[PDB]
Structure 1
């Protein structure tokens, strides 16, 4: 499949993004439990108590049993509101997080994908370089069988041949481990991916750094949270201060209670005291409570809440310094990426001709084998460097998008285009 398909297969199964989802869901569901306390609280009670006096109470025993139905209602309790508010701001922050986590699934899938591609290039270029050092090998031998070149010419091309093999060895191990990477992110294994279409490839000067910086300054998901979080630090200052406000609660209830006495001092005296009482009651009331002074606590708290607010602020600064540095760097790099794709595109030609000469010359005694084998090594580097440069350019784009905090499923389509030629991921 291609980038845009491999992505979607992951967006519906990546355990990391889902875990992040479930974390946002809990965060919001919690807003309920937060408001919960502002609502009616109904409970049922019932007791049974056997008493037994033993001094002036001697000879007096009793069996009472009650069962009330109590209800509570907050009339004015600032902290109970504060809490609800804060749980909401928290869910909000958790959301900005989930979004950030969504962007990461993109950058990481795209990167993982172009690693399996660059992995393939390295292998192919290593097989081309091997096949070359082989022709050159086979040839120094013929030229040596007619005494037109020392034995060293054959011993040299053999040595550099064995060496390329040790590489082709690992270059193939990497294409493998690069697919295990993709597998883990997307959850799948791919027989083939759509390779970068080198003909239709074109770089594109990036927006001026200034425009980039200014949108990121208003969209970068990281900066956004430092903002939300600073707000939350302020909201908490208020919370601390509520410790000074008074509260008004309402209570209501209806209960029955049946008591029965027994014992010495019960048999006689009468006085209608020890008669079995069977009470019934209905109640409603208001409770006002106001802190007057609590050992300095409420202020020590309000101060702390403010220092923590300063901290939240310093972190906002950091977030911003970071969103800046990330933007300028991403700008610099994408440019240097385009600039490098050119230099190497070039070097791959100057090295191709030079190799063609050395080879041609070697065949008529004008060029040394060392010159050939070195021209060969030079070409197959410029070749990989160029291949590599292209992938970094593609990624650097995604980086700027992410630094702006606007990296999405679309940016992943714009790239799904420069892809085309279906190549195998298996090193057969």
Structure 2
């Protein structure tokens, strides 16, 4: 399983990107939610009431049942439109956040894959060290048996062997934890992963840092999010200033009312004012309002909105400075990694030469088995360091691409050309 299939699986079964998608969908639906009040509002209502008179209105009882259908619609109210614009801007910032989570998901899965590979290499090196140390301990034991050293040498050799065993257990558990983390990030257990192809891996100098800044100025996600936040702050200032404006609405109502009267006074000489009445009304009206001085209220809120705008501007400037920081540091990291790669390659060459010399000496007869075993251990350590440096270089390239705000699956496509030979991840198959 190369990086491509791993990332393809991690795109679907990843229970933290789905949260961002749900948040984006909720923000999008809030646009319709905020647009709902602008639409006409109608409702039906029933009301049954009984009243009993007393004191001057002694012996008077009334019963009124009413059914009213109401329909109201605003004609001029800028606040609803301003809220709709605010919701649109919130949806935009949520979309930017979702893009950020996509990028960090790509970075995380790449990091996990390379960590698993490094754990495999470390385990192999530790197994070689274990073989060498066990042979050294057996040498010391034989020397004591025929008699050439004190018992303290045997004790020291046994202590070294036990320390090596503990290190081997630690490395095995580290590999297991790396595999578990990969499973958690992908929701699947991977028994075999593609390793690195040394021949096809060619380090390349990056483009000038100036061009990186130029692209990151107009391409970075954090800067765009801060700009959208500042725009939202401006819209909030406009909404706060909107309070000085008048409002206008139109109401319509269809009402059916039935009123009946009873009591001692009703059975009198009222005649026309005390009767059962069946009213039907079709009311249409226009309501206009215009608030005037309310203490501070709107003025204080406008001042608060201006202060929030100043804060948003400061946030935007700080975000730009942080972006410049991240781009420059990421650019320097690649050059540091290239220098480290060259140094570790030279170290590997020197270790291989030393191992070859030790092998020749042992074959001729001037060396023992423990010497060539120690040389192999040193060579394996150097190889592990070089492989870790290569993986760090790949991760640093991905880091530059992400901090520039352009990370996608094309970078993974470019990286996948260097993964050729598969290798198992089970400790028993890697090292029984």
TM bracket (short chain)? over 0.9
Aligned residue in 1 for 2:31? 31
Aligned residue in 2 for 1:231? 231
Q: Deviations over 1:123-163 (max 9, x none)?
A: 11222233334455555667777878888877666544433
- Say which SS state the counterpart of residue 293 (structure 1) adopts: coil
Aligned residue in 1 for 2:207? 207
TM-score of the superposed pair, with normalisation by structure 2: 0.92
CA distance in structure 1 between the partners assigned to 2:144 and 2:362 by the alignment = 12
Q: Deviations over 1:96-147 (max 9, x none)?
A: 1111111111111111111111111111122223333445555566777787
Does the C-alpha gap of structure 1 residues 405 and 215 become closer, same or farther in structure 2, counting only changes over 3 Å?
Answer: same
Q: Is the contact made by 1:34 and 1:83 (CA closer than 8 Å) also made in structure 2?
A: yes
User: Structure 1 residue 416: deviation in Å?
Assistant: 1.6
CA distance in structure 2 between the partners assigned to 1:207 and 1:283 by the alignment = 74
Deviates more, 1:371-380 or 1:384-393: 371-380
User: Structure 1 residue 367: deviation in Å?
Assistant: 8.0
CA distance in structure 1 between the partners assigned to 2:346 and 2:89 by the alignment = 55
User: Structure 1 residue 401: deviation in Å?
Assistant: 1.0
- Say which SS state the counterpart of residue 201 (structure 1) adopts: coil
Aligned residue in 2 for 1:74? 74
User: Structure 1 residue 78: deviation in Å?
Assistant: 1.1
Q: Is the contact made by 1:157 and 1:373 (CA closer than 8 Å) also made in structure 2?
A: no
Does the C-alpha gap of structure 1 residues 30 and 150 become closer, same or farther in structure 2, counting only changes over 3 Å?
Answer: same
CA distance in structure 2 between the partners assigned to 1:5 and 1:295 by the alignment = 65
Aligned residue in 1 for 2:97? 97
Q: Deviations over 1:209-261 (max 9, x none)?
A: 11111111111111110111111011101011111111111111111111111
Q: Deviations over 1:31-88 (max 9, x none)?
A: 0010001111010011000011112222211000111110011111111111111111
CA distance in structure 1 between the partners assigned to 2:381 and 2:69 by the alignment = 84
Aligned residue in 2 for 1:363? 363
Does the C-alpha gap of structure 1 residues 169 and 356 become closer, same or farther in structure 2, counting only changes over 3 Å?
Answer: farther
User: Structure 1 residue 278: deviation in Å?
Assistant: 1.0
Does the C-alpha gap of structure 1 residues 342 and 103 become closer, same or farther in structure 2, counting only changes over 3 Å?
Answer: same
Q: Where do 5+ consecutive residues of structure 1 fail to align?
A: none
- Say which SS state the counterpart of residue 243 (structure 1) adopts: helix
Aligned residue in 1 for 2:86? 86
User: Structure 1 residue 289: deviation in Å?
Assistant: 0.8
Aligned residue in 1 for 2:145? 145
Deviates more, 1:276-285 or 1:14-23: 276-285
Deviates more, 1:313-322 or 1:137-146: 137-146
Q: Where do 5+ consecutive residues of structure 2 fail to align?
A: none
Does the C-alpha gap of structure 1 residues 9 and 295 become closer, same or farther in structure 2, counting only changes over 3 Å?
Answer: same
- Say which SS state the counterpart of residue 199 (structure 2) adopts: coil
- For 1:105-184, what aligned pairs fall within 5 Å after superposition? 105-136=105-136, 159-184=159-184
TM-score of the superposed pair, with normalisation by structure 1: 0.93
Q: Is the contact made by 2:125 and 2:377 (CA closer than 8 Å) also made in structure 1?
A: no
CA distance in structure 2 between the partners assigned to 1:130 and 1:352 by the alignment = 20
Q: Is the contact made by 1:107 and 1:398 (CA closer than 8 Å) also made in structure 2?
A: yes
CA distance in structure 1 between the partners assigned to 2:13 and 2:301 by the alignment = 45
CA distance in structure 1 between the partners assigned to 2:271 and 2:423 by the alignment = 104
User: Structure 1 residue 201: deviation in Å?
Assistant: 1.4
- Say which SS state the counterpart of residue 218 (structure 1) adopts: helix
Tell me how many residue pairs correspond in the alignment.
428
Does the C-alpha gap of structure 1 residues 349 and 159 become closer, same or farther in structure 2, counting only changes over 3 Å?
Answer: farther
Q: Is the contact made by 1:153 and 1:369 (CA closer than 8 Å) also made in structure 2?
A: no
User: Structure 1 residue 406: deviation in Å?
Assistant: 0.9
Deviates more, 1:354-363 or 1:285-294: 354-363
CA distance in structure 2 between the partners assigned to 1:71 and 1:171 by the alignment = 73
User: Structure 1 residue 287: deviation in Å?
Assistant: 1.0
Aligned residue in 2 for 1:339? 339
Does the C-alpha gap of structure 1 residues 129 and 199 become closer, same or farther in structure 2, counting only changes over 3 Å?
Answer: farther
Q: Is the contact made by 2:128 and 2:377 (CA closer than 8 Å) also made in structure 1?
A: no
Deviates more, 1:276-285 or 1:348-357: 348-357
Deviates more, 1:145-154 or 1:23-32: 145-154
- Say which SS state the counterpart of residue 265 (structure 1) adopts: coil
User: Structure 1 residue 348: deviation in Å?
Assistant: 1.5
User: Structure 1 residue 361: deviation in Å?
Assistant: 6.0
Aligned residue in 2 for 1:424? 424
Does the C-alpha gap of structure 1 residues 30 and 66 become closer, same or farther in structure 2, counting only changes over 3 Å?
Answer: same
Does the C-alpha gap of structure 1 residues 329 and 224 become closer, same or farther in structure 2, counting only changes over 3 Å?
Answer: same
Q: Deviations over 1:347-386 (max 9, x none)?
A: 1221333355467668999789999898666544433221
Does the C-alpha gap of structure 1 residues 146 and 346 become closer, same or farther in structure 2, counting only changes over 3 Å?
Answer: farther
The RMSD of aligned alpha carbons is 2.6
Does the C-alpha gap of structure 1 residues 355 and 133 become closer, same or farther in structure 2, counting only changes over 3 Å?
Answer: farther
User: Structure 1 residue 331: deviation in Å?
Assistant: 0.9
- Say which SS state the counterpart of residue 266 (structure 1) adopts: coil
